[PDB]
């Protein structure tokens, strides 16, 4: 699918993703903190439709992501990200998507998630995160 | 004067300052690189006029600042920045302002200047820089 | 188990762990790079014995670890780290221990594993890694 790279910012304020309960994660778009002021990133859309959107508004300064978990698996010959979940210091934004395949989890003990990059076609093919202090 | 803080970015692409040959540095405004795309910062103007503008366009990826030098001194009871000069890996953007008072220089051996903060009234009262890898 | 924390150094030269094909990883020690000079970390021993030793000598500057994989599982009630495999740019130091339970994997796209921390009772209970540029 089409690769994307948001880059590095000051923090995260809101995450907006999409999913399908029988396939995988679809759309992905995050609004970052750029030195105090929000900065909305490019909307990375899927090649198709029929996804259920999710808007994750964090209490910016005080609430930040502590762990990112999910599942990768093959759906129709394409190994993609099927589920994604964000746990913060205040709440857990429950498993979105199908919780099947092989697991992964990135807990941060000291550091902050500061940016996103990855790829999206019909579903989210892959993704990586930028970390900082 | 009025304090300002641009914050941290990915790099610098252009610096736009102003000076008076008999007083000190006046206006200050920089356009940064925010993950590949330029980002123009807020224009920090002086309380007064009659300054000679300077536009410093760097060859972004390839040309970056290696040292920042200048002079601080008192001009009319106000200790301000009287001169400022930026030397890059390709050129020296010669002393702008009055080269009188006490000197300072910040050479970077490994690192990049990534943001600016300081204060401006009639002249640039002070300033600090954000460094990164 | 007993908590340890080696800290952060400049790089990694060698890793000496211990395992058992039916239980999990036991002993754990690592000799780091400290500004171009080897630095032998403390030996974090298991409370019991009967493990098989493995020495992982990297070609220090040239060879560096790019991804750490493993398994977290339940043995004797305790959830511990059952397997561990290190993938460097030159070779893969094959899985040690039991590849059974919940998988975890950290691929590093930009950065270095620069230190370790964790806990060891009879087996490695958990660990964490310091990441640097």
């Amino acid at each position: 699918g089409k690769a994307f790279d948001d880059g590095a910012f000051t923090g995260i304020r809101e995450i907006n993703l999409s999913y399908n309960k029988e396939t995988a994660i679809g759309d992905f778009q995050v609004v970052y903190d750029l030195n105090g002021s929000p900065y909305v990133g490019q909307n990375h859309k899927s090649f198709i439709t029929g996804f259920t959107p999710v808007k994750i508004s964090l209490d910016f300064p005080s609430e930040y992501i502590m762990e990112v978990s999910g599942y990768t698996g093959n759906v129709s010959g394409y190994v993609v990200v099927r589920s994604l979940t964000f746990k913060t210091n205040k709440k857990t934004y429950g498993p979105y998507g199908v919780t099947s395949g092989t697991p992964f989890n990135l807990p941060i003990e000291n550091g902050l998630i500061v940016g996103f990059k990855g790829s999206i076609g019909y579903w989210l093919d892959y993704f990586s995160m930028y970390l900082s202090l | 004067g009025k304090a300002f803080d641009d914050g941290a970015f990915t790099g610098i692409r252009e610096i736009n300052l102003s000076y008076n040959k008999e007083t000190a540095i006046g206006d200050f405004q920089v356009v940064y690189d925010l993950n590949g795309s330029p980002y123009v910062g807020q224009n920090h103007k002086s309380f007064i006029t009659g300054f000679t503008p300077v536009k410093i366009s760097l060859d972004f990826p390839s040309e970056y600042i290696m040292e920042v030098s200048g002079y601080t001194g008192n001009v009319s009871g106000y200790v301000v920045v009287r001169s400022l000069t930026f030397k890059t890996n390709k050129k020296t953007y010669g002393p702008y302002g009055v080269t009188s008072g006490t000197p300072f220089n910040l050479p970077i051996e490994n690192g990049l200047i990534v943001g600016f903060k300081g204060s401006i009234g009639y002249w640039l009262d002070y300033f600090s820089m954000y460094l990164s890898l | 188990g007993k908590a340890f924390d080696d800290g952060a150094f400049t790089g990694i030269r060698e890793i000496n762990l211990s395992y058992n094909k039916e239980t999990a990883i036991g002993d754990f020690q690592v000799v780091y790079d400290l500004n171009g000079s080897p630095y032998v970390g403390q030996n974090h021993k298991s409370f019991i014995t009967g493990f098989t030793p493995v020495k992982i000598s990297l070609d220090f500057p040239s060879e560096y670890i790019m991804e750490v994989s493993g398994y977290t599982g339940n043995v004797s009630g305790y959830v511990v780290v059952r397997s561990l495999t290190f993938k460097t740019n030159k070779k893969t130091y094959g899985p040690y221990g039991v590849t059974s339970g919940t998988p975890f994997n950290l691929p590093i796209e930009n950065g270095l594993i620069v230190g370790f921390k964790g806990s060891i009772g009879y087996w490695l209970d958990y660990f964490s890694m310091y990441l640097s540029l």
Binding site: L106 | - | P107, N110
Partner: peptide, 15 residues
């Protein structure tokens, strides 16, 4: 050089 760098982790999904 010229561009800032940060630790980027992963690439979870398609190899």
């Amino acid at each position: 050089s010229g561009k800032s760098q940060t630790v980027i982790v992963g690439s979870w999904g398609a190899k």
